[model samples]
Target: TDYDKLSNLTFEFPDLTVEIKGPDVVGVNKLAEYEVHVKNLGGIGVPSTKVRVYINGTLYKNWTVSLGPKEEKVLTFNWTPTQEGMYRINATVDEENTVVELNENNNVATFDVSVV
Candidate 1:
């Protein structure tokens, strides 16, 4: 397993959502592209926020980005599974709790990925 922000001055805090979009099954030792999307769902925008990817409960990659209100950004990472098994994929936004958000609970998404 391998693992891998924002500020706004507005009175209405920004709400963020992290979504994982990728394959459910991949070949072991073969590179697969996984997409992690971050969206601003509240009344304001955020500048330079942190997004992270975790595989099997471990850190995989980090991304810093900005999003306007109702806007979204996507990051893709090529991951090669080292073993054959089921893996958990986690994508999180503002995982450090440093950003003010409308809903902190909605910033994470988890999915199951398998390697053959």
Candidate 2:
């Protein structure tokens, strides 16, 4: 997937990324920790990025973060589900689309969370 985003690419830019790392299975009303990784995987560093997290397409929470080149930082979100079903947990770095990127594809992450 190293296909370049911009065909006329000459200079390298920062790719601010986001991913979820935690239990996909949980009990109802139980507080679960989901480690959200916001990273910079590009030629340059990205600082002061606002990360926004959504649960089932609704805004859950947001956090402020910064990262250097190839650096990653984890943000933990302790959440509780009222009911038992499947939930869509997704997050995006620089959600405002203000910061440019090398390949913006990986900038957002989505995980299917199952609650029992």
Candidate 3:
């Protein structure tokens, strides 16, 4: 009866973890893309995982890629801020399915990227 709840249900793997590198807090000009690195520490490869970028809670872009076991990949993209303000760069993976089970120290990481 509640398909929406069922669809929204997420079962994060117990030992899945992700690490973000580069520009923990970035300050840049307009129309400049930031480089970010992500690594899979779940001890498994994620196939057809979608990486979505959120800028100030708005959907900026969605990137699709597959990560190998303990594999690390660097993502290079540009974010053009229409106005000068403080924004956060959030990278989401496995939006459709829980690629990595939720666990302590294994979850989404938020980084700040300020534009001037």
Candidate 4:
């Protein structure tokens, strides 16, 4: 049997920010790419986490990534809509709440898009 114990270790929660960027207007049946950015605003590094993207209340895609302290990552998701209209896009980081963060409300971002 082996046992190890350590003391005086400090732990700090990670703060993540997820933002989606894309054109405000798109064409019907055309490929539209949405960029999702995840940033770490805390003093510690973050492990691999899940990110979920949605369009008009529908699941678009899910991604996983890891970020270092004060580091940021950018990911893209493409979608082609058959119809033309206004759509709502949203991105959420740490969707399962597996990682503890400093702020929970700031983990989601939403925007509007118009398809012509």
Best by TM-score: 1
Per-candidate TM-score against the hidden true structure: 0.87, 0.85, 0.65, 0.86
Q: How does model 2 score by TM-score? A: 0.85
Return the lDDT, model 1, position 61: 97
Q: Using TM-score, rank the candidates from best to worst.
A: 1, 4, 2, 3
Regions of model 3 farther than 4 Å from truth:
1-29, 100-105
Give the top-scoring candidate (lDDT): 1
lDDT winner, 1 or 4: 1
Local distance difference test, each candidate:
0.83, 0.81, 0.55, 0.81
Please give the lDDT score at residue 11 for candidate 3: 21
User: Candidate 1: which pairs clash?
Assistant: 3-58, 3-59, 3-60, 4-59, 4-60, 4-61, 5-49, 5-50
Instruction: Give the per-residue Cα lDDT of candidate 1 at 28.
Output: 93
lDDT of 4 by residue, 16-91 (tens): 7888888989999899888998887776888798888989989889988998877788998888889999999989
Error of 2 at 7 (Å): 20
Candidate 1, overall lDDT? Answer: 0.83
Over 67-107, each residue of candidate 1 has an lDDT whose tens digit, in order, gives 98778788999998889998999999888877788879888
- lDDT for each residue of candidate 2 in 45-91, tens digit (9 for 90 to 100): 87788999999999999998878876778899899889999999999
**Model 1 TM-score, all chains together:** 0.87
Model 1: residue 84 alpha-carbon error in angstroms = 0.4
**Backbone clash pairs in model 1 (N, Cα, C under 3 Å; residues 3+ apart or in different chains), count:** 8
